[PDB]
Amino acid sequence: PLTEVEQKAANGVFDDANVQNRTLSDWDGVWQSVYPLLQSGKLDPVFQKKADADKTKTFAEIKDYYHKGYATDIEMIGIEDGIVEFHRNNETTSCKYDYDGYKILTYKSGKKGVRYLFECKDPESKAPKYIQFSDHIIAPRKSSHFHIFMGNDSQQSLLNEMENWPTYYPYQLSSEEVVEEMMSH
Numbered sequence: 001p002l003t004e005v006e007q008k009a010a011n012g013v014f015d016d017a018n019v020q021n022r023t024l025s026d027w028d029g030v031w032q033s034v035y036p037l038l039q040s041g042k043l044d045p046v047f048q049k050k051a052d053a054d055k056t057k058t059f060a061e062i063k064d065y066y067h068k069g070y071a072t073d074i075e076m077i078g079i080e081d082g083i084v085e086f087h088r089n090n091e092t093t094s095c096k097y098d099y100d101g102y103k104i105l106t107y108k109s110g111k112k113g114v115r116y117l118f119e120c121k122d123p124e125s126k127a128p129k130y131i132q133f134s135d136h137i138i139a140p141r142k143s144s145h146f147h148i149f150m151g152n153d154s155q156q157s158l159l160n161e162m163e164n165w166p167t168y169y170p171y172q173l174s175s176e177e178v179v180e181e182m183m184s185h
Contacts, residue, residue, distance in 0.1 A: 010136040012111030016104055020139040022116050024082060024097060027133055027143050031077040031168035034178060035070040038063075042175050046182045072166035077148070084118075086127060095120035095127035103159055114138045117155055130155050134165070145169045145181065 002010065005018055037043050047066065051059040076087040085094040097118035105113050115132040128150035135146040147165040149158040169178050 006137070006139075006141070009138045012107070012109075012113060012136075014112060014138055018138060019102065019104055019114055021099075021101060022137075022140050024079065024084070024099060024118065026116075026137075026140065027079050027135075027146060029079060030171040031079070031146070032171040032173075033070070033072055033075050033077075034167045034169060034182075035072055036075075037175055037178060038066060038070050042179065043182070045179060049183060068163050069165050070167050071164060074166060076171060077168055084127065084131070093125065093127040095122050095125040097127075097131065100155070103155075105159065107162070115149070115159060119155075128152055130158055132158050144185070 005014070008014060009018065034043070043066065044063075047059050047062040051057055051062050073088050074086050075089070078085040078087070082096045083094050084097055085092060098121050100117040100119050102117060103115045105115060107113065113134055113136070115134050118131050118133075120127050120129055120131075129152045130150070132149040132155070133143070133146050134149070135143045137143060145168060147167050149161050149165065151158055169181065173181075
């Protein structure tokens with residue numbers, strides 16, 4: 001169900017002229033952090049396969065890399081009617097985020113990605129001032145999973161973040177299915 005342009009953009013290959021703005025509604029739904037799967041051992045098959053297929057890397061290096069990447073105490077995210085909710089252990093923050101457009105990034109690998117930028121302008125909210133979505137999509141399309149960046153300093157600080165990228169799949173997916181997607185999608 002992917003066009004050549006979408007399929008290549010998914011793999012970090014695209015012309016900048018094909019990148020288009022999106023809206024918050026692309027990430028509407030209830031979403032679950034993948035971090036507990038890593039911690040329980042349920043992602044081990046993912047790292048096992050990757051380590052096997054790549055002769056220059058080991059299981060421990062791969063798992064540690066995703067441990068840094070996935071680490072977060074934000075267990076779920078809900079997005080509905082313009083509001084993003086961050087669920088921690090019993091505690092919950094939210095904001096009606098403003099869209100701020102996107103930024104195209106060229107990574108050290110020469111692959112490319114796009115960050116979709118939002119800002120909380122509610123002086124009453126306790127949610128992060130700036131957030132960014134990255135999900136291998138460069139034009140309007142409902143997301144099937146996403147990486148999110150959050151902070152209070154600047155958008156540019158987040159643009160540089162490459163170590164920690166808390167990651168979220170639809171909360172209705174079983175663990176097997178989240179594993180299958182990480183192996184396949």
